[PDB]
Design a protein around this ligand. Structure first.
Ligand SMILES: Cc1cn([C@H]2C[C@H](OP(=O)(O)O)[C@@H](COP(=O)(O)O)O2)c(=O)[nH]c1=O
Ligand SMILES: [Ca+2]
Length: 129
């Protein structure tokens, strides 16, 4: 997989954000994770965590997997990096997302993320508290 450049247009919630990619505005949905909706427990905390990570970053990058690059809603499906650190992994490591939506063909980072989930659950963080 390869990282490609993007810039933040605006935060949306824990697992979606509006980025500019190849010069066009797109909503991205983070691969392999599911944050709570803003109206659910830890939804606000997730939204804040992703908003902070993306807004503080000097460099945002998007990395597509081997499979579908857009979902049925027209959202881009990617791993997103904020100064080289993966947002998807970070959310999971903090107990603010669960590994979820693991579809064959787009699951390159599955075991990285499951290792993070195990550590979050071991620490009883957030969702696992
Ligand atoms: C993460 C992800 C979600 N989806 C679709 C599946 C779910 O469909 P349904 O809308 O029919 O439930 C929805 C969940 O996204 P959200 O968690 O953002 O709601 O997004 C994909 O198709 N591919 C993906 O990789
Ligand atoms: Ca969600």
């Amino acid at each position: 997989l390869h990282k490609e450049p993007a810039t933040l247009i605006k935060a949306i919630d824990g697992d979606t954000q509006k980025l500019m990619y190849k010069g066009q505005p797109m909503t991205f949905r983070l691969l392999l994770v599911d944050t709570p909706e803003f109206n659910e427990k830890y939804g606000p905390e997730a939204s804040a965590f992703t908003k902070k990570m993306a807004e503080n970053a000097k460099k945002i990058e998007v990395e597509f997997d081997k499979g579908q690059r857009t979902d049925k809603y027209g959202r881009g499906l990617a791993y997103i990096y904020a100064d080289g650190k993966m947002v998807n992994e970070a959310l999971v490591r903090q107990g603010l997302a669960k590994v979820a939506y693991v579809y064959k063909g787009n699951n390159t980072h599955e075991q990285l993320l499951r290792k993070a989930e195990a550590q979050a659950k071991k620490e009883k963080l957030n969702i696992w508290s």
